[PDB]
Amino acid sequence: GIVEQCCTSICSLYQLENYCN
């Protein structure tokens, strides 16, 4: 999911925002 994606590949802050409460 996002944890793996950000580390194996790349990820954007906009994608990180999907994890906020």
Partner 1 sequence: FVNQHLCGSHLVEALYLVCGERGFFYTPKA
Tell which residue, 15, 13, 20, has the closest CA to residue 1: 15
Q: Which of residues 1-21 bind partner 1 (CB under 8 A)?
A: 1-4, 6-7, 9-14, 16-17, 19-21
Task: Report, in Å, the least distance between residue 10 CB and partner 1.
Answer: 4
Task: Report, in Å, the least distance between residue 5 CB and partner 1.
Answer: 9
With 0-12 CB in 10 A as exposed, 13-18 as middle and 19+ as buried, what is 5?
exposed
Amino acid at 20: C
Binding-site ranges for partner 1 (CB under 8 A): 1-4, 6-7, 9-14, 16-17, 19-21
